[PDB]
Design a protein around this ligand. Structure first.
Ligand SMILES: C[C@@H](CCCC[C@@H](C)Cl)Cc1cc(O)cc(O)c1
Lengths: 366, 372
């Protein structure tokens, strides 16, 4: 199974992290919330993000629209970004939509029917297009989706598939964060809850990524493209409460313990996958690690004894676009394929972590 | 790919359809809503359902709990039913959880992480279990799940997979239906166009129910792949262009709203015959030689439409009507309940062909070709 090409799509408004921090400080100031505002600045700086794309508005932070309207805009933005990314992908590869056998999607955006079904009215896919709409995987979704498409293409060596991941984190800013922070600060053991919501506001951003993958018999399956040679999943027992998304609007759950609980899954997962492919982690030329946060990046480095430069792509990505959740690893893979040189027959590893607590690893070979 | 076994799981409270109709009438009356109460009886009767399982309380009609409490209850009940069904499936097949390679789930219950991930803490699956949590498919999810798992097992002939589907339709009775019907009826005098909206919500209240089905599927080289079992020999999807608005589930201010427009049955015709005719033709089969049909009963009109389109004798879809009467429309789980009934029927004649058909949001249709 071969990764042939990638693309990304972002909304029009890129906000410097300092603008975002200032907007939230305005909110605390207007609502007379008793909390150190330097905590807002400290967390927005310490996540090491230079700016983020928000598809949904910031100008209405003090007067958010209704929940129904925010869901409607989030759905429309998700569809628009996904259409843009898919159309760029087909164009750069000169592939016709009718020649795509499977369209796989990941997104936390509420969509029944799913985003991939809706896109069939915007792009002239065949009416018998196979679809793989996935959810419940959060930040892990991009890596997760690549593994699922690879497993499909193992049985369909002649076919082509598109995976896309899109998330609208800015939906958080349409009332959920405002209400929750106001209530928590006013009742202030709740200090950690306020910190978590501030971290959520500092970290998460919007965007979309897409990947074209083909089986070994497809005409686009050529040497020098990354090959998915194996993949594996891991779920750490009894960690459901550490990460996820609770409907309340909604609240992002990201407990401080997450980075430590990752150690329980990372090495069992990756070391077992590599051993079963007769290589060691030190054989890997390229790591593509989802930047859940600065501490996640540091933990992966420590667990595998990596040099300070090996995960630089995770840090640069986080600086450039923030944590765009499931889409992040696709953006990163896009950077590798577009801007970087990969030695022939070198090995790469995609790693992502998300709610469950779950981790996903994909072994690549050029 | 072989279908080895099936199981179901239902909550403890089964309500007669007449009690449910009376509960909604009581809500209209206590709220003093100016709507013809006989329309509730009409639709609760015309869906041809005798009773339904409700996991969530009927008292929430008059005293709705908070949105978060209802979501938490829905999640807990989804997990409990799925665990029961999976455990019954593993016990009846004498299969250890560690020998399951893939666990696929379909459900509209909001769950991040997905229900299949949470179940790994209840059932000793191995930590490297592969998961396939699908969503955005609604009533079609059962048949859709079968197809995706069959596609997976094409590439993994020695592996075993479990699919489960679970839906808690009674969540709409925890405040969404009450809020929407109230607003729609009260705005009706100034806006007559809202009448069809009120009927739709009444139909939703009449039709959808709770439950769970699960299926064990294995690849051709698995030791459980034996001749008597139904084999998935092909499957196909279809999506009808420009029909998103006819069926789905929207998140709104009132909570959730189920969308099911009267035009669905007619739009069904646009997809059903190209889908099924093409699937059958590509496998050198004609519909008249099908031994069995397993058609998701989206409604009585849906059943009649499938019957008419394929010129079926009206006993051919009797299992759709019997299922609707017994448990109502339990959405993605329904075809799994139906398949479980079939596997308790007379040993299907060897080399007999069967077709699973289900329709759902998109508007999308899924057809699966079985051979016994
Ligand atoms: C829009 C919200 C809605 C919450 C779930 C409610 C439904 C299951 Cl009923 C989810 C979301 C969060 C996020 O951080 C990025 C996204 O793309 C999407």
């Amino acid at each position: 199974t071969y990764i042939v090409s990638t693309s990304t799509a972002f909304p029009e408004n890129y906000y410097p992290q300092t603008v975002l921090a200032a907007a939230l400080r305005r909110f605390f100031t207007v609502m007379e919330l008793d909390f150190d505002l330097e905590q807002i600045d400290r967390f927005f700086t310490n996540v090491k993000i230079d700016g983020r794309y928000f598809a949904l508005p910031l100008d209405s932070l003090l007067d958010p629209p209704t929940w129904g309207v925010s869901i409607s805009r989030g759905l429309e933005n998700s569809l628009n970004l996904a259409e843009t990314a898919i159309t760029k992908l087909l164009e750069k590869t000169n592939v016709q939509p009718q020649d795509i056998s499977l369209l796989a999607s990941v997104s936390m955006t509420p969509a029944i029917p799913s985003l991939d079904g809706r896109l069939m009215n915007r792009i002239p896919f065949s009416s018998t297009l196979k679809r793989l709409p996935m959810n419940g995987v959060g930040c892990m979704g991009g890596a997760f989706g690549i593994s699922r498409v690879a497993d499909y293409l193992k049985a369909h060596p002649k076919e082509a598939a598109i995976l896309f991941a899109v998330e609208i984190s800015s939906a958080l800013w349409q009332g959920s964060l405002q209400a929750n922070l106001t209530s928590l600060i006013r009742r202030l053991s709740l200090y950690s809850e306020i910190i978590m919501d501030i971290i959520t506001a500092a970290l998460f951003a919007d965007g979309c990524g897409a990947v074209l993958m083909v089986g070994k018999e497809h005409p686009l399956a050529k040497s020098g493209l990354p090959q998915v040679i194996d993949n594996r999943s891991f779920l750490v027992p009894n960690t459901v409460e550490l990460m996820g998304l609770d409907v309340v609007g909604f609240r992002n759950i990201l407990r401080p313990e997450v980075s430590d609980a990752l150690k329980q899954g990372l090495r069992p997962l990756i070391n077992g996958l590599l051993a079963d492919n007769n290589i060691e982690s030190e054989n890997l030329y390229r790591w593509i690690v989802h930047p859940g946060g600065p501490k996640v990046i540091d933990t992966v480095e420590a667990e595998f004894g990596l040099d300070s430069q090996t995960l630089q792509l995770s840090r640069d990505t986080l600086a450039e676009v923030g944590n765009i959740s499931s889409a992040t690893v696709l953006y990163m893979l896009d950077k590798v394929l577009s801007e970087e040189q990969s030695p022939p027959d070198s090995y790469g590893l995609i790693v992502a972590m998300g709610p469950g607590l779950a981790q996903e690893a994909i072994l690549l070979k050029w």
